[PDB]
Amino acid sequence: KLLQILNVRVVGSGERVVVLSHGFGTDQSAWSRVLPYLTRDHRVVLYDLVCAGSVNPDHFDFRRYDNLDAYVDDLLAILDALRIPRCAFVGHSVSAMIGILASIRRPDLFAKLVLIGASPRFLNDSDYHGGFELEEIQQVFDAMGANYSAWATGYAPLAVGADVPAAVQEFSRTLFNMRPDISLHVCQTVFKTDLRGVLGMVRAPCVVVQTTRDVSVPASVAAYLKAHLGGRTTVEFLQTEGHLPHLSAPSLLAQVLRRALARY
Numbered sequence: 481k482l483l484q485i486l487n488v489r490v491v492g493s494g495e496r497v498v499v500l501s502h503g504f505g506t507d508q509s510a511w512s513r514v515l516p517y518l519t520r521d522h523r524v525v526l527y528d529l530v531c532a533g534s535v536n537p538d539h540f541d542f543r544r545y546d547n548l549d550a551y552v553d554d555l556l557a558i559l560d561a562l563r564i565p566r567c568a569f570v571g572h573s574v575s576a577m578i579g580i581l582a583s584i585r586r587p588d589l590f591a592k593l594v595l596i597g598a599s600p601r602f603l604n605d606s607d608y609h610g611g612f613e614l615e616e617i618q619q620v621f622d623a624m625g626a627n628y629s630a631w632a633t634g635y636a637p638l639a640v641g642a643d644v645p646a647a648v649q650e651f652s653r654t655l656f657n658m659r660p661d662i663s664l665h666v667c668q669t670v671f672k673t674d675l676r677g678v679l680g681m682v683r684a685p686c687v688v689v690q691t692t693r694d695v696s697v698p699a700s701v702a703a704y705l706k707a708h709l710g711g712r713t714t715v716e717f718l719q720t721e722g723h724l725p726h727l728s729a730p731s732l733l734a735q736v737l738r739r740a741l742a743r744y
Contacts (some may be wrong), residue, residue, distance in 0.1 A: 503573020533657025643721025
């Protein structure tokens with residue numbers, strides 16, 4: 481009953497269908513301020529990832545969700561249940577990784593991707609700057625277990641980046657709503673994911689959104705995506721700071737979404 485379980489909502493109308501898929505520490509409400517810019521021109525599908533605190537956490541099967549392919553299966557099952565044959569997909573954070581994988585599994589269904597806070601790999605590697613060393617993640621995982629509330633308190637303004645207090649408060653609200661063992665397990669799953677080898681399998685055109693600074697995504701990752709994704713890819717720069725521009729700069733991000741969703 482995924483449509484119920486994952487809080488699927490279809491709003492707006494149109495022939496151009498857009499799916500909005502939220503990232504780590506938020507739920508579909510993170511799209512609220514961009515949504516009104518899209519519903520006159522598009523049918524919009526929103527849903528919550530199984531790890532959102534707005535979903536009953538007793539649905540979180542730790543074994544099933546120890547790889548992103550299980551989140552892909554939930555997205556494709558929702559789109560097939562809704563009988564949607566073609567869409568554009570906007571993914572933030574973990575959902576940018578889900579959208580890359582889903583576009584390779586079902587190239588018929590994904591006509592365009594828009595990727596926000598996107599990276600194919602967060603850990604550094606030889607001649608690859610992901611932004612994180614192994615010892616630093618080991619400490620992130622320990623702080624999330626030792627004191628999740630203190631960790632989330634400190635992380636929310638760092639991730640929002642810009643001093644936009646309403647956005648810090650909204651992101652802290654949904655990070656504190658995540659069950660702390662689920663939040664650690666999704667963080668661990670993201671850090672074990674390395675999409676570099678599959679980037680050239682994406683066929684859809686893609687827009688990579690880049691802000692001035694993102695604590696989780698070095699500036700060089702956007703150019704690495706543009707060089708390696710298999711579809712026609714552009715980097716769209718937003719003159720704003722942070723990882724969650726849909727919370728902190730929603731009108732500015734809505735410019736890029738309306739432009740990228742105009743034809744596909």
